[PDB]
Structure 1
Amino acid sequence: WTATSGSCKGRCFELQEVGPPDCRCDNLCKSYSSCCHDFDELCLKTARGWECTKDRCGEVRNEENACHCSEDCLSRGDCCTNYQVVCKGESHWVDDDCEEIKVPECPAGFVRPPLIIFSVDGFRASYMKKGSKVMPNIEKLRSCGTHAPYMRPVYPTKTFPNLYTLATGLYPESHGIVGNSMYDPVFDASFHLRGREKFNHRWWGGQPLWITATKQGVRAGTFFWSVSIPHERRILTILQWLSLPDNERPSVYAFYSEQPDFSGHKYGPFGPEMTNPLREIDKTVGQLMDGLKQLRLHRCVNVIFVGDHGMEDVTCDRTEFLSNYLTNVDDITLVPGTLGRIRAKSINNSKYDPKTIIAALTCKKPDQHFKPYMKQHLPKRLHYANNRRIEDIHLLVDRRWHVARKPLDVYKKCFFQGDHGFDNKVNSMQTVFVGYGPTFKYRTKVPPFENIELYNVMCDLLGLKPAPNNGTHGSLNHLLRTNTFRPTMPDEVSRPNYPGIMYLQSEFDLGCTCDDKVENKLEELNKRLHTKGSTKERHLLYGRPAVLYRTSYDILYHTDFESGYSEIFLMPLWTSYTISKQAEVSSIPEHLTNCVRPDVRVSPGFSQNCLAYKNDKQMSYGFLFPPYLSSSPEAKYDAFLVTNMVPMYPAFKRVWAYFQRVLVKKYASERNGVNVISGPIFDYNYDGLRDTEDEIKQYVEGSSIPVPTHYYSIITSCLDFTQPADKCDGPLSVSSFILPHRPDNDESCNSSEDESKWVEELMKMHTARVRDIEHLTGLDFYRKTSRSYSEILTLKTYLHTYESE
């Protein structure tokens, strides 16, 4: 209930929100039906429109006008944004040459440059270039400030998950807004795009920037606008707030545009009707910048122009129907469209089974345009699993397609031509970032980055300490002229042991065999030097990774590779080796086919055993440093040490052997050598974080050998590929993956074919940032390079996407 009998006189767009039953005058009151009776009359004036004309100049102040062209309007802060151009001979901001802003040029009483966030919905990254002729104001921000050629949204590339990610620096799984539509089984409640449940504070996790600001005494504009308030009025309201006395004036502001998303859904991303919405957004940007210029704030304020996601061509005839796959289609609830989420229709149904639902959806039609996944099997780069609101069964839909339950859902709901929501590495889903202002760099292009990184930078821009988030603070320091946050490397927690030869062969009872019984002073000293780390500078190029948790591990050196061997997990945490462009691939000699060798530096009690693998009918083993890449027949024996062995499903060994035998060499040829770090990952509770030993759900049968959920590799080389990986003078180049360790290759529809037809496609899907592997392993890589730490942070957030230009 609202006693809407109070009045808005002198309160229009008030910054504090008044509590019920008293009526509201703030920019959100409409959306709650809580505005005072006179809100429209007083606060939403429209008379005479939004622009000054020649014959309004000097005019007597008429209070009924939307904006003013009277002589006192500058002092009142309520001129039409074009007042000085029309009435005072000034130029539009867009018409002025750009001049570097080396220092903030702020009026007296400004304690910091204010931040204005200009957010646009559905603004696809290619619009920056393709629409550049019809967006001169945006083009000037882009070319004169700091810009990325695109910014990567989070998955799902929907509106609510992305806008709230932008505001919090968190993955949707951590902030809680995991879709525009959600069911929370603990609340037993639904969140919708349409309605009143989406207002309840229990849905919203993390700490959004407006809250961070307020807690630390930085004043925030009310960030959100009821949909019916027109853009011109949003802008004028912002500019009016900018004229408040020092003590009352916010330091951070937001503007939101429902366009171009609204038209893009109707017309597709490049429909001819899309030009006008782009012109209109540019005009709003012009109005803001002209208004800042009139207030002498145009060289004081930092402006972020930022999108939530792009837009793809999608029409009703490209819909897959679950009714064509499932018999029991009435026993399921589907969240439909550009992603699919499936759960039981009734909790009381004990005949519901996810396993049979997944199988019925798996590789069933030759052209199938979606792929089912249990959520823990989704590519780890999506970070889309650790929330009770994310249904166990997920459908990843191909770009340009929809999934629906039954054909009736699509005609008792073609309307639309555009949609978004697909995999966040899809080109069409990429969106925009431009920063302009004293704190941003001048005419600077920065590499593409993820939207999770921006919360830290907005905090930096405002002098705030960010709440804990998923950005990597310092990875975007290269966007900024100053205010940089100077990160330090985390301290190593566990130091390694360096074991020497401590055990005789006969102390081992591992049930292993090796035909290594084939037998010299110069060569003997040589092998000893290798085992003490003589070749280590070759294979460990960036220092050893640091272990950031408490554990017991050994560094083991070899001619061809170095490893950090965990006495707790009984396998390496990491294995590091360098392959030059000139390296040769050899085969495993016939006599060495089943060779496994005890490692005389490591006790029997901290070793794996061959008997466990013999007894476990489901599990085989592989090696982290591959025998195919040994530098010599004698060095090959090192690759068969029990301390280089890891458990692998036969199905997964198909993937791994092809990576090891074919792809590593291919990369070394293409990249002029590669340094490789590989190892296991244990993430049984799918939180994206290293498991402790008590969380491991699966062991090699009858043993304490834990089974990894995933295998990772990090492949580094020189950015300037004219220099070899092992002699690189400058920036580095990386690609990584986190491959799911699965007992089958059901994920890959073409897997009955030769690995050359499917394995690389699987790996590309499971591409990863080095930072993702850090969270999953508790390791810290690139500790000893010649590069600055912020540049290394940028390299660790890099994701190799495998999309065309």
Structure 2
Amino acid sequence: GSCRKKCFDASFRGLENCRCDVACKDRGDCCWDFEDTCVESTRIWMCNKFRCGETRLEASLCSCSDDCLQRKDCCADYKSVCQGETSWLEENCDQCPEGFDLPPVILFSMDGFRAEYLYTWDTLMPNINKLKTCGIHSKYMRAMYPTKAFPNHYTIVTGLYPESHGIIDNNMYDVNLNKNFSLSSKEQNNPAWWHGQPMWLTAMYQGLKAATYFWPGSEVAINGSFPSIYMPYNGSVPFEERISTLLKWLDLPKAERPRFYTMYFEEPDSSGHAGGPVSARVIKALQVVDHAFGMLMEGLKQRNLHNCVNIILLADHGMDQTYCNKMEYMTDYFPRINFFYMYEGPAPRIRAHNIPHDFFSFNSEEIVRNLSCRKPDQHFKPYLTPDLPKRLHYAKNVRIDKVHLFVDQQWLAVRSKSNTNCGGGNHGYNNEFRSMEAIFLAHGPSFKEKTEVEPFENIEVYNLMCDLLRIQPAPNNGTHGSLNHLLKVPFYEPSHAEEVSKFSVCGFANPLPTESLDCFCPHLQNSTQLEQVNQMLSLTQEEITATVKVNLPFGRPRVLQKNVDHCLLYHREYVSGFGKAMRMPMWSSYTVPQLGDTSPLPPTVPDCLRADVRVPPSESQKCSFYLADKNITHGFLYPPASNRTSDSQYDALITSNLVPMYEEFRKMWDYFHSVLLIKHATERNGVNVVSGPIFDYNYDGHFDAPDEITKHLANTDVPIPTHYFVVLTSCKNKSHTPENCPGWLDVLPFIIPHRPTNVESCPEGKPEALWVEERFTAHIARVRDVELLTGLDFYQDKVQPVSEILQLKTYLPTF
């Protein structure tokens, strides 16, 4: 015989007197199968032909003995390797066993698994590829900025932007605590850094036990509590050991068995850093993680759990390649740099060197000014954080330093040329960069099968996981219901938000104005001319219904602000919502048709403004306000030169269509409406436009209350916007116009900062054709971002399921 079932038996002589004792290795008389049967069998996580039926040993990590199933310690592939059962991988695409009344949730993260890995190398990852084929598969998942591990892992489990959850980078300083946060320090375990409610506490608070294996934050007594089970972090733990512990937890008695699980792997992030995203090291790491993931599914199948668990496989961010010849140096821009401290790399920040003493005295403004437009080809742009694109939601936290550098693809910004941290993979860049996109795959009885879904953001996963466990989520930044199309039977059915402030009436009464408002239009020097022109503002009921049909084709925006007095101004070519206290419109809606001639609109007739007879002078702007205010002029919300009849431009040359605009912004503003808007209308077969002011002086992402607004027009109460929004909405099916679209819509939203100079664009002396469109593109945002910043709610009259409208409102155009 051989060593099968005779390991370490010195008294045993088999064929040709071969021996199976520990000393046979030296004497050189071992039976042929000794090493694999008796030595390597205690160092591996897999059964094989040598091990099946084996006699139990001591130091074995798992068992292939005939009693392992009753003892509950079989290796994961025992049944398929030893019992001839079909592996999970060999099974076709798709049930809970006894005691698993409800399906547990596994949240599985593979650090640095970028969406392109799954596109190019899927055939090198058969287990992951099987998950993608059989379950639900998003084109990619968008991370939050900056695309770092701790900020995004904690976003995933809280539903919160970093500015809200507190972990705004892997390295940061908090002047209030006067402490430093870093991944190698014990300060990261101070619960004071961790705000919000992570998913394992949401479950625990609502009666469901939670086990975490190495998830960021799970080793912290957040809000005073650890997870039910958690593991002190140690990256050296083999992945198979982690998977085996997860399967053991699923073997706990029902009364002790967690319902929510998290799992974390350092790969392919670690190999991405070492070798770059296209490298043998990443390829090998991708095969390793795929092997360990398969181990999990095989072990689930051994327990008949493969189709009972709702598993989500995703990642925190992607990976890009860096170069030592693509580095920007602060020494190139400052003669002395020893007075400030720099968080370096793909998403740098600059703060005072002497902290906490000079933290707030630091002249962040001068730093950003001296870094602006210094070279024509400089590969980063400095920002004060309130000036960053609003879709990043990266400003409202004292831990976010005011000075920020937004760095171009594959570049790095460092202090000095001494820096050698280059040549490998890195991340942290703009979350819209393709290289920073992450994967999201799910599978389970609650998910749809064999379904590909559009991209979505990692802030949406928290609500989804609460829906999977049928519990209520803590308040977060997801849009609940936006991921219902992932689910067979949604747990949460969304509904339209009900309007808070009802609209008033601004009907047409007297054709002459009680007050001139200090506005002048010599073209109407007589009174007969005025009465006729203003009469054009009088629309019949039939004319009101016609303009609403074309220019409000999805229904008016609803006001979710409280105690806001507003009325609707009907015109033939546009409808607006006038904010009485504000003395300017909250929104203006109009639909731009497709035209053959792409002739840019001509300039508005100048020197002609008059009052709105429908709006009383107490609630109207005065043209003298703008003359008085030397630092700001007036702009038009609805473009008057886009008139489609002989004298309809008069309908736009009224005080009710005026908004405060710095001269330099209005140049940008008018170019967009005169040139770019027309192109968008011709490409989209017409486009509906809704535009208006945004006030966010505390840069918290929410509309300001009137008493939060700190800048006003001249000596009046008329506020100056911080931003203007422009939402372009057309029919996804280009065969239809925006007003005759029975299917899905297609949106392109802008949130353009209203700044007194164009230094963000470094015009330098170039025509607007060479930088305006670039500036607007940099400030694309979601509709929901506009809703949050305005207190408005869109598309409520679009006949379509709410959850599909929620998909539309979370969509981010990318380029």
Task: Return the TM-score normalized by structure 2.
Answer: 0.89
Does the Cα contact within 8 Å between 1:150 and 1:449 map onto a contact in 2?
Answer: yes
Q: What's the counterpart of residue 25 of structure 2?
A: none
Equivalent residue in structure 1 for 2:62, among 67, 81, 86 = 67
Give 1:122's match in structure 2, choosing from 112, 115, 133: 112
* Alignment correspondent of 2:346: 338
The Cα shift of 1:154 comes to 0.3
For the pair 1:87 / 2:82, whether they are aligned, the reply is yes
Q: Does 1:497 align with 2:504?
A: yes
Cα deviation, 1:411-462, whole Å, max 9, x if unaligned, reads: 4xx6641100011111110010001111111111100000100000011111
Question: 2:287, 2:764 → 1: CA distance?
Answer: 49
1:126-205 matches, cutoff 5 A:
126-205=116-195
Identity percentage of aligned residues: 47
Question: CA shift at 1:492, angstroms?
Answer: 0.6
Equivalent residue, structure 1, for 2:734: 721
1:357 and 2:357 aligned: no
CA apart distance, 1:86: 1.5
For residue 405 of structure 2, what is the aligned residue in structure 1? 395
Q: Distance in 2 between matches of 1:661 and 1:521?
A: 28
Equivalent residues in 2 for 1:537-686, closer than 5 Å: 537-550=549-562, 551-582=564-595, 592-686=605-699
Task: Output the CA distance in 2 between the equivalents of 1:617 and 1:146.
Answer: 58
Identify the match of residue 378 of structure 1 among 380, 388, 396. Answer: 388
Q: Residue 758 of structure 2 aligns to a residue in which SS?
A: coil
In the superposition, relative to structure 1, how do residues 751 and 143 fare at CA in structure 2: closer, same or farther (>3 Å)? Answer: farther
Is 2:706 aligned against 1:693?
Answer: yes
- Counterpart CA distance in 2 for 1:318 and 1:46 is 49
Aligned to 2:301: 293
Deviations 1:96-122 (A, max 9, x none): 1213xxxxx111111211111110101
Deviates further, 737-746 or 362-371: 362-371
Cα distance in 2, alignment partners of residues 351 and 498 from structure 1 = 50
The 3 A distance-change label for structure 1 pair 425 and 370 is: same
Q: Per-residue displacement from partner, 1:385-432 (whole Å, max 9, x unpaired)? A: 000000011111111111111223x14xx6641100011111110010
Contact 1:545 1:783 (C-alpha < 8 Å) held by counterparts: yes
Partner of 1:57: 52
Summarize the Cα distance change of 1:194–1:503 in structure 2 as closer, same or farther, 3 Å threshold: farther
The one-letter code of the counterpart of 1:698 is K
Distance in 2 separating the partners of 1:403 and 1:317: 12
Question: SS where residue 790 of structure 1 aligns?
Answer: helix
| Stretch of structure 1 that moved more, 338-347 or 471-480 | 338-347
| CA distance in 1 between partners of 2:535 and 2:757 (Å) | 44
Task: Report the Cα distance in structure 1 between the residues aligned to 2:253 and 2:121, rounded to whole angstroms.
Answer: 39
| 1:283 Cα deviation after fit | 0.3
Change beyond 3 A, Cα 1:600–1:190: same
Residues 800/295 of structure 1: CA separation in 2 closer, same or farther (3 Å cut) = same
Structure 2 residue aligned with 1:452: 459
In 2, Cα distance between equivalents of 1:385 and 1:176: 11
1:265 aligns with 2:273: yes
Q: Which residue of 2 aligns with 1:321?
A: 329
- 1:733 alignment counterpart: 746
- Secondary structure of the structure 1 residue equivalent to 2:679: helix
The question of whether the paired residues in 2 share the 8 Å contact of 1:503 and 1:602 is answered with: no
Contact 2:407 2:413 in 1 (8 A): yes
Tell me if the contact between 2:533 and 2:650 (Cα under 8 Å) persists in the aligned partners: no
- Does 1:112 pair with 2:129? no
Shift of 1:124: 0.7
Larger radius of gyration: 2
Contact 1:337 1:403 in 2 (8 A): yes
Q: CA deviation at 1:275?
A: 1.1
Matching of residue 786 in structure 1 with residue 799 in structure 2: yes
Matched letter for residue 535 of structure 1: T
Q: Does 1:800 align with 2:808?
A: no
Change (3 A) 1:230 1:317: same
Q: CA deviation at 1:525?
A: 8.6
What amino acid maps onto 1:200 in structure 2? Answer: N
Tell me, yes or no, if the aligned pair for 1:331 and 1:352 is still in contact at 8 Å: no
Residue pair 2:213, 2:242 contacting (<8 A) in 1 also: no
- Name the amino acid aligned to 1:528: L
Change (3 A) 1:587 1:432: closer
Q: Which residue of 1 aligns with 2:767?
A: 754
Task: Give the one of 509, 521, 540 matched to 1:529.
Answer: 540
Q: Would you identify which runs of 4 or more consecutive aligned residues in structure 1 move more than 6 Å?
A: 519-526, 583-586
Can you list the C-alpha shifts for 1:152-196, whole angstroms capped at 9, x where unaligned? 000000111010000101000000000000100000001011110
Gaps spanning 5+ residues in structure 2: where? 1-39, 215-230
| Distance in structure 2 (CA, Å) of the matches to 1:516 and 1:751 | 38
Q: Which amino acid aligns with 1:659?
A: F
Q: Which segments of 5 or more consecutive residues in structure 1 lack a partner in the other structure?
A: 1-44, 100-104
In the alignment, which residue of structure 1 is the partner of 2:438?
Answer: 431
CA shift, 1:73, in A, is 1.7
SS of residue matched to 2:729? strand
Is the Cα contact below 8 Å between 2:780 and 2:813 reproduced in 1? yes
The answer to whether structure 1 residue 366 and structure 2 residue 373 are counterparts is no
Kept after mapping to 2: 8 A contact 1:120/1:306: yes
Q: How many Å separate the matches in 2 of 1:519 and 1:678?
A: 28
CA distance in 2, matches of 1:48, 1:520: 95
Deviations 1:712-749 (A, max 9, x none): 01111111101112111111111101000010000002
TM-superposed deviation, 1:703: 1.7
Aligned partner letter, 1:387: N
Letter in 2 for 1:754: P
Q: Distance in 1 between matches of 2:559 and 2:293?
A: 48
Q: Which string of whole-angstrom CA distances, capped at 9 and with x for unpartnered residues, describes residues 46-72 of structure 1?
A: 933111122322223334210111122
Question: Is the Cα contact below 8 Å between 1:564 and 1:574 reproduced in 2?
Answer: yes
What amino acid is the match of 2:557? Answer: P
Q: Matched residues in 2 for 1:343 and 1:526: separation?
A: 55
The 10-residue stretch of structure 1 (750-759 or 264-273) with the greater mean CA deviation from structure 2: 750-759
Greater displacement, 90-99 / 785-794: 90-99
SS in 1 for 2:760: coil
Asked if 2 retains the 8 angstrom alpha-carbon contact of 1:374 and 1:392, the reply is yes
1:322–1:503 CA distance, 2 compared to 1 (3 A)? farther
Aligned residue pairs total 749
Structure 1 residue 359, shift from structure 2 partner:
1.7
Partners of 2:511 and 2:534 within 8 A in 1? no
> 1:368, CA displacement in angstroms?
0.6
Matched, 1:467 2:457: no
CA–CA distance in structure 1, aligned partners of residues 535 and 157 of structure 2: 62
> Is the contact between residue 266 and residue 415 of structure 1 (CA under 8 Å) also seen in structure 2?
no
2:240 to 227, 232, 235: 232
Q: Over residues 646-693 of structure 1, what are the superposed CA-to-partner deviations in whole Å (9 max), with x where a residue is unaligned?
A: 011111011110111111111110000101100000000000000000
Rate the CA distance shift 1:722–1:345 in 2: closer, same or farther, 3 A.
same
- Contact 1:82 1:287 survives alignment (8 Å): yes
Deviates more, 1:109-118 or 1:425-434: 109-118
Residue number in structure 1 paired with 2:414? 404
Q: Aligned Cα RMSD in Å?
A: 2.0
**AA at the equivalent of 1:202:** A
Q: Secondary structure at the match of 1:738?
A: strand
The two structures have a TM-score, normalised by structure 1, of: 0.90
Write the mapping of 1:694-713 to structure 2, written as runs, cut at 5 A: 694-713=707-726
Indicate the larger mover: 628-637 or 558-567. Answer: 628-637
The residue aligned with 2:518 is 511
Whole-angstrom distance in 2 between the partners of 1:141 and 1:589: 58
